[PDB]
Amino acid sequence: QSNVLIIGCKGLGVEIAKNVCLAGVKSVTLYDPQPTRIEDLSSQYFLTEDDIGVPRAKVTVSKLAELNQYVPVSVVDELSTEYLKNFKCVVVTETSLTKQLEINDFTHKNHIAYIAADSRGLFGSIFCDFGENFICTDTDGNEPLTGMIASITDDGVVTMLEETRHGLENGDFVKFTEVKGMPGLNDGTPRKVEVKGPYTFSIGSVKDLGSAGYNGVFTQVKVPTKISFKSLRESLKDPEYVYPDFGKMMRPPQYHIAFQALSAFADAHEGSLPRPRNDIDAAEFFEFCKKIASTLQFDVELDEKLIKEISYQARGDLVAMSAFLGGAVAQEVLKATTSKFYPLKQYFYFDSLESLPSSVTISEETCKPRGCRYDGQIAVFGSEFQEKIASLSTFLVGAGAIGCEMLKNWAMMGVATGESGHISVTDMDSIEKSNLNRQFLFRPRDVGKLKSECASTAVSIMNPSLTGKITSYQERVGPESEGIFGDEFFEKLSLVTNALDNVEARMYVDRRCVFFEKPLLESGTLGTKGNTQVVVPHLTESYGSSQDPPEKSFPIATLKNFPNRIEHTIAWARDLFEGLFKQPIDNVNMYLSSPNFLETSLKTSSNPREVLENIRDYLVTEKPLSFEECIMWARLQFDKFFNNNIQQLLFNFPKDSVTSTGQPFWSGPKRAPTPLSFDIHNREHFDFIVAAASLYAFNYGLKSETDPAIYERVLAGYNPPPFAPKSGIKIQVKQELKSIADSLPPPSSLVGFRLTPAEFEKDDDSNHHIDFITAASNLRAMNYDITPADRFKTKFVAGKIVPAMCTSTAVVSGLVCLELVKLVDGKKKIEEYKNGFFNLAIGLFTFSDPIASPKMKVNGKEIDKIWDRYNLPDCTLQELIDYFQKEEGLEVTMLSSGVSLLYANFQPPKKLAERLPLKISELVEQITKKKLEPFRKHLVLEICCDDANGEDVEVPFICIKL
């Protein structure tokens, strides 16, 4: 029931739609009849050069529909007030405050979620209004608390075990399962929680259940709270702020007025905003602020220098601001459509004003439109800075979720467009088939190809000026000379951006950027949480670190055919849940809704035949009348995934077949499976039937029986279709669609009839979801002889394998690029850089200054313990000693390359005379008896020094540039 309308298809609106489609709402409808201008290609990556003139919504819908095949996207050319009732949430962008009041006054009374967002230069605002009765089922990002119990006392004190999870509140509810000693406590009815200590909590007197209870598990049941939102009209007078930065606490009240005057200016100028850095327009703009500050009886004192800056940047359109605001706003849409997180309440006024360049001229003349696709960025940073961007040489590590967002941001900014510019992208991974509907740049035609290579191509279409400027690799940023990114590669670079969660890559990328003194931008995400890190040479610390810890991933052939751990069966069970009770239901509902679904699915779907077979199987062939046919369907699924597929697997590879070597095929990570025969009196087998049949009946809206006498009756006369393993099946280690379409009932014959999709939810123990995943996982584990896991461990493992969220991924990419322009400006003051952290689930945002690098003094001069070093050519050993004595006032006492002692000042001339005239590279090759590798272009030396008085002075390492 989560229909989303999005008003406005500029840079901001197209980012929100991208994330909302990739997040997977019911449907998205766009509204933007305005013709495409040239200045919209500053942040609108779905508009090309020869799309100028056409309405922005019509050109962008075909690119949105290609994102997620289970999210129908449509366009409206007209907008009615009553038409808004077709949507659970309404997002408004690029709209005057006049129309916002007209829209919000309706949505607030009809209980329609309202979000208004605007990207205006380096300034932005987000307003949320979810009605005055909005119910939220989860007020924090935390999953419901679970853990094992030590004991429960008769007074009601529950002492928690080694787990001691985090963290309980008062008024929460917990339910108990398998707590021995108190039988009636495991019924399922929750109990109130009063926390006594960090390991205990009280549930009330349980003396009516037993003297002492032991063991068991507790699961928190979160009580839904209600949140009263004020309308835009009444919050315009009394605004409630959410602060993105407590250091800019005095700025939201200024921003609240400036954005209102920003619309009062558009009313007086045919909807146009003030001109870039225009003093005449900003003078008129300040006056508007002065009027609105008086009528709203605001006690604030107008920061004229700050407010006028909003006018100077009014018509700026930065892709970084669209990524940051767009990801956050899309997360608010999901809060409105799932009721699962705490919304922004209600005003989120934001700036990244420190990103404003200072090494170039910012004026009317510099920020004047040029007629190109970068006008929206030039309107803020100026024309001279645009060439600084265009000549950048960047190195992006990783082409997954964050890397693709990063490349998108670089293509809209003109990075590496100019003469000396170049982009280098690397990622060893390839594109697979499972996650295609969650990928931004990847489509079904790219399966098997390299992520980095396809990402470069998709970005070169967003900005054709990047063709030939991007070089794609399939390499890890790894060991030293083996590289294969050597000294020549890193010295050309302007900066490095790390978009991988890999711990290996982070270590090397950090270490390499320190040695070559190149700026580093780092980013990572973990669910709703994310953080950004900027490393500036000769300024900040090289690590910052304390990002969120990473997560794992599994090979395709391991999950599908050769599992050997219980975590493999759980992922396989979670994906199965999606294929039986989710994706086919979505295909059916779209076929009954979108009239052009037949041709839309051919271009978008990864498996257009399975889409059509889903519609046929679920609408006619296997549509159940009663729950008794749901049990027969569930019984058929048992053979289909725990018997027929295993017979097929043993058919292609028998239990005792051999490889090319002659060794058994089933050995090591490959465990020999065994098909299951259905035992109705086996707990795992029966728990699957109940869970699958009840979930199948859920899709069709049928009453799920739980009487084992009904199951026993149906399963006795179950006649399966005779299965025999097929030959010529590959197991990994057009008009035919009209034929299936002729087997589909006409959409007109099924008006109003819909199927209810199953949205996976671990926190409700009554929806049979975890029951299904536990049973399907344990049954597959029984196939391959793997130790099964109870529903507690299964629920735990399933919670830690959720994919990266596109909302978090967008927000970091925007934060990284808002710190990118600071690096290009060459900012040298550490207070102007920001390390970000956020948690979209609670509307928390944090911007902290980077820590300075630690310093020390050598002969009264300050040096950088991290970034300073002695750069010497491949001179002789004697010449190196002379340099430190004559030019540094230091007597070198120990010289080494790694652990190899190259020189010590006490060595007799029997050792030194043969080595002092040697070049360092010749001295190194002689000591440890090894030839220098061909692309070993530098030599790192450690050195111990004494001053003039014989005391040891700590000095940096040496870099021999050979």
Ligand X SMILES: *SCCNCCCCCCCCCC
Ligand Y SMILES: CCCCCCCCCCNCCSSCc1ccc(Cl)cc1
3-state secondary structure of 248: helix
**HEC per residue, 654-704:** CCCCECCCCCECCCCCCCCCCCCCCCCCCHHHHHHHHHHHHHHHHHHCCCC
Least distance CB 555 / ligand X (angstroms): 34
Q: Which is nearer to ligand X, 679 or 954 (CB)?
A: 954
Nearer to ligand X, 157 or 858 (CB): 858
Nearer to ligand Y, 118 or 832 (CB): 118
Q: Which is nearer to ligand Y, 266 or 805 (CB)?
A: 266
Query: DSSP characters for 408-466?
Result: HHHHHHTTT-STT-EEEEE---B--STTGGG-SS--GGGTTSBHHHHHHHHHHHH-GGG
**DSSP percent split of the chain into helix, strand, coil, nearest 5:** 40, 15, 45
Nearest distance, CB of residue 491 and ligand X, angstroms: 23
514 burial (CB, 10 Å; 0-12 / 13-18 / 19+) is middle
Give the nearest distance from C-beta 321 to ligand Y in angstroms. Answer: 17
- CA dist 598 → 161, 187, 223, 587, 609 (Å): 55, 49, 43, 10, 11
Which pair of structure tokens corresponds to residue 937? 């272009």
Binding ligand X by CB under 6 A: which of 743, 944, 946, 959? 944
Query: Minimum distance from CB of 911 to ligand X (Å)?
Result: 19
Closest CB 454 distance from ligand X, rounded Å: 39
- Of 213-252, which residues contact ligand Y (CB under 6 A)? none
Q: Choosing among ligand X, ligand Y, none, which partner's interface includes residue 96 (Cβ < 5 to 8 Å by kind)?
A: ligand Y
Smallest distance from the beta carbon of 286 to ligand Y, in angstroms?
20
Nearer to ligand Y, 375 or 405 (CB): 375
Nearer to ligand X, 595 or 898 (CB): 898
Residue 724's binding partner out of ligand X, ligand Y, none, with CB under 5 to 8 Å set by partner kind: none
Within 14-43, the residues that bind ligand X by CB under 6 A are none
Minimum distance of ligand Y from residue 267's CB (angstroms): 10
Q: Rounded distance, CA 529 to CA 542, Å?
A: 22
Kindly identify the residues of this chain, within the stretch 51-110, that bind ligand Y according to CB under 6 A: 79, 81, 94-96, 99
Least distance to ligand Y from the beta carbon of 78, Å?
8
Q: Which amino acid is at 366?
A: T
634 binds ligand Y per the rule CB under 6 A: no
By C-beta, is 266 or 454 nearer to ligand Y? 266
Q: How far is the CB of 944 from ligand X (least distance, A)?
A: 4
Instruction: Give the DSSP H or E segment for 105.
Output: helix 97-109
Q: Which residues pair with residue 180 across a beta bridge?
A: 214
Other residues' Cβ atoms within 10 Å of the Cβ of residue 731: 13
Question: Interior CA angle at 188 toward 184 and 194, to 5°?
Answer: 85
Question: Is omega for the bond preceding 826 within 30 degrees of 0, making it cis?
Answer: no
Site for ligand Y in 802-841 (CB under 6 A): none
- For the bound state, the minimum distance from the C-beta of residue 255 to ligand Y, rounded and expressed in Å, comes to 19
- What binding mask, one character per residue, do residues 896-925 give for ligand X by CB under 6 A, x or -? --xx--------------------------
Site for ligand X in 864-903 (CB under 6 A): 898-899
Binding at 266: pick from ligand Y, ligand X, none (beta carbon under 5-8 Å per type) = ligand Y
Instruction: Tell me the site size for ligand X, rule CB under 6 A.
Output: 4
Nearer to ligand Y, 82 or 488 (CB): 82
Min dist. Cβ of residue 827 to ligand X (A)? 33
Q: Pick one of ligand Y, ligand X, none as the site partner of residue 95 (Cβ within 5 to 8 A by kind).
A: ligand Y
Residue 785 or 933 with smaller CB distance to ligand X = 933
Strand order in the sheet with 3-7: 73-75, 27-31, 3-7, 89-92, 113-120, 123-129, 347-351
- CA dihedral 332→334→338→342, nearest 10 degrees, is -30
Please identify, using beta-carbon distances, which residue of 79 and 731 lies nearer to ligand Y: 79
Tell me which of ligand X, ligand Y, none is bound by residue 942, counting a contact when its beta carbon lies within the kind-specific cut-off of 5 to 8 angstroms: ligand X
Residue with tokens 């004229």: 304
Residue type, 630: C
Residue 508 DSSP SS3: helix
Nearer to ligand X, 52 or 944 (CB): 944
HEC profile of 335-380? HHHHCCCCCCCCEEEEECHHHCCCCCCCCCCCCCCCCCCCHHHHHH
Q: Which does 944 bind (CB under 5 to 8 A by kind): ligand X, ligand Y, none?
A: ligand X
Alpha-carbon span 537 to 2, nearest angstrom: 47
Contact 220, 144 (CB under 8 A): yes
Strands 200-202 and 89-92 turn out to be unpaired
Q: Which is nearer to ligand X, 227 or 856 (CB)?
A: 856
Q: State both tokens at 721.
A: 């279709």
| DSSP strand pairing (146-153 vs 212-214) | antiparallel
Comparing every residue's Cβ against ligand X, the nearest one is 944
Specify the residue, 270 or 951, whose C-beta has the smaller distance to ligand Y.
Answer: 270
The binder of 593, among ligand Y, ligand X, none, by C-beta within 5 to 8 A per type, is none
Shortest separation between residue 481's beta carbon and ligand X, angstroms? 15
Give yes or no for a contact between 539 and 517, defined as CB atoms under 8 angstroms apart. Answer: no
Ranges of H-type helices in 784-824: 791-799, 806-824
| Shortest Å distance, C-beta 37 to ligand Y | 8
Choice between 41 and 477, CB closer to ligand Y: 41
Using CB positions, name the residue nearest to ligand Y: 271
- The option from ligand X, ligand Y, none interacting with 317 (CB < 5 to 8 A, set by class) reads none
DSSP secondary structure letter of residue 620: I
Residue 898: which of ligand X, ligand Y, none does it interact with, CB under 5 to 8 A by kind?
ligand X
Contact status, residue 389 vs residue 413, Cβ threshold 8 Å? yes
CB of 942 to ligand X, least distance (A): 4
Q: Which of 132, 874, 891, 942 binds ligand X (CB under 6 A)?
A: 942
99 binding partner (options ligand Y, ligand X, none; Cβ < 5 to 8 Å by kind): ligand Y
**Dihedral sign, Cα of residue 627, residue 633, residue 638, residue 641:** negative
- Rank residues 120 and 768 by Cβ distance to ligand Y and give the closer one: 120
Total of chain residues touching ligand Y, rule CB under 6 A: 8
Instruction: Give least dist CB 915 to ligand X, A.
Output: 19
| Beta-bridge partners for 75 | 30
Nearest to 923 by CA among 878, 877, 870: 877
Helix (H) or strand (E) holding 217: strand 217-221
Q: Segment 246-305, which members bind ligand Y (CB under 6 A)?
A: 266, 271
Q: Please provide residue 73's backbone torsions phi and psi, each rounded to the nearest 5 degrees.
A: -115, 135
Least separation in angstroms between CB 803 and ligand X: 38
Rama region for 156: left / alpha / beta (φ>0; ψ in -120 to 50; rest):
left
Q: Which is nearer to ligand X, 384 or 480 (by Cβ)?
A: 480
Residues 258, 266: Cα–Cα separation, whole Å:
12
- CB 866, min distance to ligand X, A: 16
CB-nearer residue toward ligand Y: 85 or 623: 85
Element (H, E) at 125: strand 123-129
Binding partner of 269, given ligand X, ligand Y, none, CB within 5-8 angstroms per partner class = none
Q: Write out the residues near ligand Y by the rule CB under 6 A.
A: 79, 81, 94-96, 99, 266, 271
Q: Write out the residues near ligand X by the rule CB under 6 A.
A: 898-899, 942, 944
